[PDB]
Inverse folding.
């Protein structure tokens, strides 16, 4: 007769969303951008074709020393000051709560009209395409599936096999 | 969504998602080192 | 990976390929890219000569569709004088 | 309770201490209520004082069994499929020795995975799929992989009928509280329309696809996935397309036939699983009945009828409250369902119904003891729940002066007899053996009770066995052999790997086990009978229906005043039955191998797994560990480093778990309290205990952790003892 | 809010009345007899065969019955009502042009009033008789005695 589940943090799920998905922008346009036959060709000789490898797992370290830094700073002062103890304001804390952060300390604040209001108008823009980005990337992340599964010849694994017409992979279109 | 001074609950036997698993990841150390009876160190 | 010349000299190629006569399928039943056959006409059983025969002929086969309907003889039961034997 | 309603929350009850009797789980903390909650979780003296729902729950929380038996089976069909051995075993039976399960070689594991047949590593089976599975008028591994998901289909759906009850706003009274038709339906067309339906898919398809399997081939060199439609042309080899008959009746001519069936009895030479040419006829000849039968009726009438002098005035009116009980119409059932399971346990071993059983020894005795513990574990229950009636179910006393009010009238009486019955037995039913020891260890055989010393003379024969394998000469039509090959008269030639069934002779050492059974079956029942009868009132306590059918014990007075009750009569009644079945098992295999199971070769000089050691040597009750326990079991205590090994390696635990029960069985209670505090003290010093008042076991919970252990202990012990003396020689 | 599904003695019958109504023209074979010269059979045994057939093949069979089933439940929502369906076009006063209205039958309304001379000389019967057209091909798929045939005859 209907679930018991608006996770109160029904309020927070929605912000790894704008994380996950704005983000899939980075893959969506640079991919098919690629640049078909640019003129053309992909060749990267430079730091890479003679100094004994370049990356892989010095890759990650440097690579996400920064993502390191930044992803942390991201949610852990999104906002929330007050930042300790001890009775309920719910999210699972707002034990920042009624105090934002400081009683007349510094400029904790951005912007006049005693709040943080990045003004009133802009529902426009990112309500639409952006929680789009959530939606969008559902189905061209449902293409990740289509785009490659079938492990282009070079391997049948656990041999059912189980019929046979013709191949599959990616580049755009479809026989049909 | 969870800050400082204890958090949200959980069921009767989440121990069955604690015996199974965690502990489960340990067979996962008992095949990486498929064997013991003393041990080298790091 | 690591590239020397040029992702190719001559680009990707004959792996889909069909071109002059993209044929197979649309064609094959290139017996019958035109299931053309016989007479024009007419007398009898046609299906010449390859194809064959007429096997039981008139309204039968032909269906297929032989054609037509005829003052018959309209199949229905009893006859064919079940000419067996 | 709110939270708060009635009517005027959807907001569900997750949070606020308790529920279940009203100075409930109290604010104040404790542990006992955590075995409470699970125990008596299903019950009905609480939930509501009003029938209504309960039947609306049990028709749902039921459901989730079928669905389950349904998630189960699937992982068995799947399992009996891609974790193959079935494909390999079937082209190659007599030869293989089946598997479905296999480990994964983590840690010590692998020893458990030891070459089983069609060329692979695994752990064996004593659960006769691979043999229902003979059926497959088709064969194929991925196919069972459809029958498998076909299983998960029935489930999710035959599990959303359980949403589509209680949680959905439910039916009510009339629906079940008009019973008028129920069996009408059930037996007619399912009991009927299955057996019937089963007929149609038991000659159509199966018969033919093992009519020409009992020879050779390799499957798909036989039985396509559709092949068996309109094509009534291969049905040509296994009788006419009726030729000139039209819907049975008689203006029919046989100058040479009589449809499929053509009744058998005996055993296929090449697959002695009993003939299938019959198996259709018998299921057909069932259904009809059910088809005709489930057509009674609408109910009192028939029972509101035949009375007499001493008979049952209340026979007439034998329960309005049999539309208003459950605990009653469950207890009745369990006696039947239960007592109608272990009747399987015989007609199986003395009349196999699947291809390749008997030759398969271990893959149908496992059976005959699994089916055997249910036709027992469901019977003591079938008493428990009557005690649950006898105590409470109805509202008041509206039930009066009848068959029962009668039986109770005598009660220090029906159980007055039955008692002496047992000590007459026991003396004639066990010390009988003890004679032998005391006098064979004294040693003078002249005077034992041997199949040969006390007067009986080289024959048993003349009774009824010998007028069963010989009866195809009565009103009997016939059909070579009998009905069950194990009967006195005629025939031998049964099977070309190992053996199957043959006469099975008797006299003494068959005479007196058969009698220990009596005394065992009888004193079991004494304690349940007197237990459920004296359910509510007595001359040790009359104020004795005042809580429930459990209650620990009334109190130190009256002398004892402890066991009484009837939870506990259904506690010491299990304690026996564990024997009742545990010694019936001990019987069958020592017979079935001492004689029967054994083996042919030239001149078919029979060579039993044991040249009848039974003879003069079960009669001694030491011979029962000379010839049994110490003889066989040498395979359990040799079993280390092997493939089955998991049995010997259980056989120590569970031969431990039992010897842990006694601790739970044999002990006080304020004891582990008195102890639990010394503990609780040391706890408080470091500051580590109080919250949720740790408490000892609930007098009768303690008994609950006896018994249950004493059984899962004392039982699996043999479950191991067995599978370890039929796998490998036998 | 959560979607609805009212059971009540006999929805199952209004939508069950309807199911067969659709299947009464999905009866197809003899309602539109030009439909199958031989198309009732999806594709004999002998049968007929003197595949099943030449063909109109293919794949893209699920996508249809799904995607246009992604319409059956729209003339089931849209006309819950609050009307604005004719979004017209921002500018342009020249769009009096209508088409119909809500249609059931000869259209917008019935129309062109003016009628009767000759054609000449409820409505569960417009249902009842076409299951007496549906379930009829039902056995006619397997409509054979084969070994023998018409005893009758
Ligand atoms: C997704 C759904 C769902 C939800 C949210 C609920 C919620 C509820 N149900 Mg419920 N129910 C459901 C599906 C659901 N049900 C289904 C599918 C069935 C039929 C199969 C039922 C049959 C049912 C009955 C008869 C009752 C309820 C009741 C209730 C209420 C008490 C629930 C409770 O705490 O039980 C806790 C129990 C569970 C969460 C597990 C359910 C047990 C089954 C279905 C699966 C477990 C078996 C499993 C194999 C365990 C044994 C093996 C083990 C070794 C792992 C609550 C509102 C009760 C009520 O109205 O209040 C008195 C009432 O007794 N339900
Ligand atoms: C068709 C019947 C079936 C049904 C539907 C019921 C239903 C019921 N019985 Mg019941 N019963 C049955 C057969 C049945 N019984 C049989 C055959 C017996 C004889 C053994 C009994 C003996 C019995 C007793 C003594 C009692 C009931 C009670 C009840 C009621 C309480 C149910 C409960 O809370 O779960 C109880 C289940 C548990 C708490 C789960 C614990 C199970 C443990 C012991 C595990 C078993 C060992 C197993 C090997 C361990 C799993 C593997 C492990 C090693 C990993 C309920 C109405 C009780 C009552 O008070 O009536 C209102 C009462 O206690 N029954
Ligand atoms: C179930 C067992 C039982 C039975 C039936 C027997 C029977 C026997 N034992 Mg024995 N024995 C037993 C247990 C039993 N024992 C045990 C447990 C031990 C060890 C404790 C022994 C140790 C033992 C020894 C050492 C010896 C025996 C011997 C004997 C034999 C002589 C008996 C005798 O002379 O009594 C005299 C008989 C009577 C007075 C007969 C009357 C009693 C009957 C009729 C009661 C019947 C009730 C009545 C018919 C009810 C009908 C109602 C009426 C109105 C019609 C006899 C065959 C002796 C022997 O050598 O045997 C070969 C030997 O002495 N036993
Ligand atoms: C705690 C006590 C102490 C200990 C250590 C034991 C130990 C034992 N007693 Mg014992 N006993 C004791 C006190 C003790 N007793 C007392 C005070 C008495 C009363 C005087 C008894 C009366 C008694 C009797 C009558 C018996 C025993 C027996 C036994 C033995 C069983 C064989 C065995 O376990 O092989 C050891 C090997 C294993 C346990 C291998 C286990 C591998 C398996 C189980 C799998 C691994 C474990 C896994 C968790 C299980 C799967 C469960 C899963 C679902 C979670 C065991 C050695 C029995 C016996 O065998 O001979 C006398 C006999 O029944 N005892
Ligand atoms: C450099 C950093 C590293 C670190 C420290 C973090 C840290 C964080 N990431 Mg993150 N992330 C990383 C690499 C990292 N990420 C990478 C390499 C990717 C993929 C390219 C992501 C993709 C990602 C997504 C989609 C999200 C996060 C989110 C988060 C936040 C919650 C993470 C979480 O799952 O809770 C840990 C809790 C557990 C129970 C485990 C947290 C600040 C989420 C967020 O921002 O929430 C507001 C969500 O948006 N990350
Ligand atoms: C074969 C067994 C089996 C089945 C079919 C059931 C079925 C049921 N049990 Mg149950 N139970 C069992 C074994 C079983 N139990 C055992 C072994 C125990 C241990 C004592 C319990 C202890 C227990 C309790 C305390 C309760 C139930 C309850 C229930 C009912 C609640 C269904 C629900 O609320 O949502 C179904 C929910 C899901 C399917 C969610 C998924 C959860 C996992 C486990 C899967 C349902 C009738 C509840 C009740 O009173 O109803 C009668 C009650 O809360 N059971
Ligand atoms: C009646 C049975 C029940 C039981 C006791 C088992 C037991 C087992 N299954 Mg299983 N299974 C079941 C139902 C069951 N299954 C059903 C209904 C399905 C269909 C969804 C499956 C599909 C399945 C698969 C695909 C696998 C198992 C495997 C296994 C084994 C791996 C152990 C594990 O599950 O956790 C760990 C174990 C012997 C695994 C196996 O056989 O490999 C050794 C394999 O992973 N099962
Ligand atoms: C209830 C059962 C079960 C089911 C679902 C079927 C179903 C079928 N049987 Mg059948 N059959 C069954 C049990 C069953 N049989 C049994 C037990 C026998 C032996 C006593 C037969 C002997 C049999 C024969 C000889 C034939 C069939 C044929 C058929 C098919 C069409 C004719 C028909 O019987 O019904 C539908 C009724 C009409 C068409 C009128 C149909 C698939 C026939 C066939 O192959 O297809 C035409 C024909 O060959 N059956
Ligand atoms: C010591 C042990 C164990 C033992 C154990 C033993 C020593 C024994 C046991 C046993 C068990 C059992 C036993 C269970 C079960 C079961 C089953 C499953 C059964 C089944 C069956 C059936 C079906 C019915 C009847 C028959 C049979 C039984 C077969 C352990 C210990 C430990 C430690 C150190 C610490 C931590 C934890 C652990 C790790 C845990
Ligand atoms: C086990 C203790 C003996 C007490 C019972 C003995 C009485 C009956 C005699 C033997 C019983 C076993 O029966 C067995 O007889 C013969 C053994 O010689 C075998 O004889 C079989 O072998 C030969 C091969 O053609 C032929 O002699 C027979 O036609 C054939 O039946 C059979 O496999 C079986 O029918
Ligand atoms: C030994 C014995 C006890 C003592 C037995 C006890 C206290 C068993 C209860 C022990 C529980 C099961 C330990 C539970 C602790 C853990 C579940 C908590 C940690 C959670 C896990 C992760 C370990 C009784 O209470 C008793 C009562 C009546 C008759 C006989 C006896 C009897 O024989």
């Amino acid at each position: 007769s209907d679930p018991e589940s608006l996770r109160w943090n029904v309020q927070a799920e929605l912000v790894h969303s704008r994380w996950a998905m704005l983000g899939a922008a980075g893959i969506f346009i640079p991919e098919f951008l690629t640049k078909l036959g640019i003129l053309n060709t992909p060749s990267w000789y430079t730091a890479g074709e003679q100094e004994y490898f370049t990356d892989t797992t010095t890759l990650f370290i440097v690579e996400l020393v920064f993502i390191g830094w930044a992803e942390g700073r991201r949610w852990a002062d999104i906002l929330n000051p007050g930042c300790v103890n001890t009775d309920p304001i719910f999210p699972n804390n707002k034990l920042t709560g009624t105090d934002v952060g400081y009683p007349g300390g510094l400029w904790f604040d951005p912007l006049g009209w005693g709040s943080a209001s990045p003004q009133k108008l802009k529902e426009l823009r990112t309500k639409e395409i952006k929680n789009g980005r959530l939606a969008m990337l559902a189905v061209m992340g449902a293409w990740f599936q289509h785009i490659y599964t079938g492990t282009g010849p070079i391997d049948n694994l656990f041999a059912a096999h189980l019929a046979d017409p013709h191949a599959t992979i990616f580049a755009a279109f479809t026989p049909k | 969504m969870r800050d400082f001074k204890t958090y949200l609950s959980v069921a009767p036997v989440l121990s069955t998602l604690w015996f199974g698993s965690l502990a489960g990841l340990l067979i996962e150390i008992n095949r990486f080192f498929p064997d013991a009876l003393t041990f080298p160190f790091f | 990976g690591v590239i020397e010349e040029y992702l190719e000299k001559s680009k990707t190629n004959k792996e889909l390929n069909d071109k002059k006569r993209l044929a197979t399928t649309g064609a094959n039943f290139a017996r019958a890219y035109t299931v053309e056959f016989g007479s024009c006409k007419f007398p009898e059983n046609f299906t010449g000569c390859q194809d064959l025969a007429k096997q039981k002929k008139v309204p039968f086969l032909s269906d297929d569709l032989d054609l037509e309907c005829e003052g018959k003889d309209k199949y229905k039961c009893g006859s064919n004088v079940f000419w067996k034997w | 309770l709110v939270d708060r309603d009635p009517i005027k929350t959807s907001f569900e009850q997750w949070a606020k201490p308790g529920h279940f009797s009203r100075t409930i789980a109290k604010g104040p903390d404790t542990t006992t209520w955590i075995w409470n909650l699970h125990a008596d979780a299903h019950d009905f003296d609480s939930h509501t004082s009003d029938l209504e729902e309960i039947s609306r729950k049990v028709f749902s929380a039921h459901f989730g069994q079928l669905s389950i038996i349904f998630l189960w089976l699937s992982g068995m069909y799947f399992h009996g499929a891609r974790f193959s051995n079935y494909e390999a075993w079937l082209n190659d039976p007599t030869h293989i020795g089946p598997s479905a399960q296999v480990v994964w070689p983590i840690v010590g594991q692998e020893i458990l995975n030891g070459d089983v047949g069609g060329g692979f590593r695994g752990i064996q089976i004593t659960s006769g799929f691979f043999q229902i599975w003979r059926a497959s008028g088709i064969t194929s591994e991925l196919q069972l992989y459809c029958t498998a998901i076909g299983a998960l289909v029935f489930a999710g759906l035959m599990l959303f009928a359980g949403w589509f009850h209680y949680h959905k706003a439910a039916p009510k009274l009339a629906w079940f509280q008009d019973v008028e038709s129920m069996l009408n339906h059930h037996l007619a067309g399912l009991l009927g329309l299955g057996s019937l339906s089963w007929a149609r898919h038991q000659v159509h398809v199966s018969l033919p696809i093992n009519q020409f399997l009992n020879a050779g081939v390799d499957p798909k060199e036989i039985p396509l996935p559709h092949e068996f439609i309109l094509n009534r042309d291969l049905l040509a080899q296994l009788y006419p397309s009726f030729a000139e008959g039209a819907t049975p009746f008689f203006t029919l001519n046989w100058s040479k036939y009589a449809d499929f069936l053509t009744f058998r009895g005996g055993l296929d030479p090449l697959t002695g699983g009993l003939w299938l040419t019959d198996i259709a006829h018998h299921h057909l000849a069932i259904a009809i009945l059910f088809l005709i039968a489930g057509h009674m009726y609408r109910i009192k009438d028939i029972l509101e009828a035949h009375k007499g002098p001493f008979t049952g005035q209340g026979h007439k009116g034998l329960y309005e409250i049999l539309t208003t009980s459950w605990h009653a119409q469950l207890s009745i059932n369990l006696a039947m369902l239960g007592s109608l399971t272990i009747v399987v346990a015989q007609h199986m071993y003395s009349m196999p119904p699947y291809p390749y059983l008997a030759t398969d020894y271990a893959t149908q005795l496992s059976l005959f003891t699994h089916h055997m513990w249910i036709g027992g574990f469901l019977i003591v229950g079938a008493a428990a729940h009557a005690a649950i009636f006898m105590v409470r179910d109805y509202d008041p006393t509206t039930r009066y002066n009848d068959l029962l009010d009668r039986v109770l009238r005598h009660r220090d009486a029906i159980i007055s007899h039955l008692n002496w019955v047992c000590i007459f037995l026991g003396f004639h039913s066990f010390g009988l053996y003890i004679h032998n020891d005391t006098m064979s260890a004294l040693g003078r055989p002249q005077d034992m009770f041997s199949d040969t010393a006390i007067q009986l003379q080289p024959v048993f024969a003349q009774w009824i066995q010998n007028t069963h394998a010989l009866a195809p000469g009565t009103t009997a039509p016939g059909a070579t052999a009998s009905t069950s090959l194990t009967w006195g008269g005629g025939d031998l030639v049964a099977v070309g790997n190992k053996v199957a069934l043959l006469p099975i002779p008797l006299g003494t050492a068959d005479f007196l086990v058969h009698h220990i059974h009596a005394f065992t079956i009888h004193v079991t029942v004494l304690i349940l009978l007197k237990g459920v009868l004296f359910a509510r009132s007595s001359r040790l306590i009359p104020d004795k229906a005042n809580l429930g059918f459990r209650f620990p014990c009334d109190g130190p007075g009256r002398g004892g005043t402890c066991q009484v009750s009837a939870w506990d009569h259904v506690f010491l009644g299990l304690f026996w039955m564990y024997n009742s079945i545990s010694v019936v098992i001990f019987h069958f295999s020592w017979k079935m191998q001492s004689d029967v199971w054994g083996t042919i070769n030239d001149q078919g000089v029979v060579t039993h797994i044991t040249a009848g050691n039974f003879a003069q040597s079960s009669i001694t009750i030491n011979g029962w560990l000379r010839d049994f326990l110490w003889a066989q079991a040498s395979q359990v205590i040799q079993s280390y480093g092997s493939s089955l090994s998991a049995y010997g390696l259980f056989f120590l635990g569970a031969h431990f778990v039992w010897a842990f029960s006694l601790m739970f069985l044999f002990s006080g209670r304020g004891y582990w309290q008195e102890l639990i505090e010394s503990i609780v003290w040391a706890h408080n010093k470091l500051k580590v205990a109080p919250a949720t008042q740790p408490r000892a076991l609930s007098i009768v919970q303690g008994r609950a952790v006896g018994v249950t252990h004493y059984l899962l202990g004392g039982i699996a012990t043999t479950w191991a003892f067995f599978l370890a003396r039929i796998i490998a020689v036998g | 809010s959560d979607p609805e599904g009212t059971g009540g003695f006999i929805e199952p019958k209004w939508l069950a009345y309807g199911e067969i109504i659709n299947g009464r023209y999905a009866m197809l074979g003899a309602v539109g007899a030009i439909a199958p010269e031989i198309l009732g059979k999806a594709g004999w045994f002998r049968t007929g065969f003197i595949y099943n057939y030449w063909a109109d093949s293919y794949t893209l069979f699920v996508f249809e019955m799904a995607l246009m089933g992604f319409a059956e439940h729209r003339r089931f929502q849209d006309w819950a009502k609050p009307g604005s369906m004719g979004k017209q076009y921002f500018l342009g006063l020249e769009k009096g042009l209508g088409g119909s209205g809500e249609p059931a039958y000869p259209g917008g309304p019935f129309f062109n009033p003016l009628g009767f001379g000759k054609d000449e000389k409820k409505l569960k019967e417009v249902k009842n008789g076409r299951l007496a057209m549906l379930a009829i091909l039902g056995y006619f798929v397997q409509a054979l005695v084969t070994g023998v045939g018409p005893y009758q005859n």
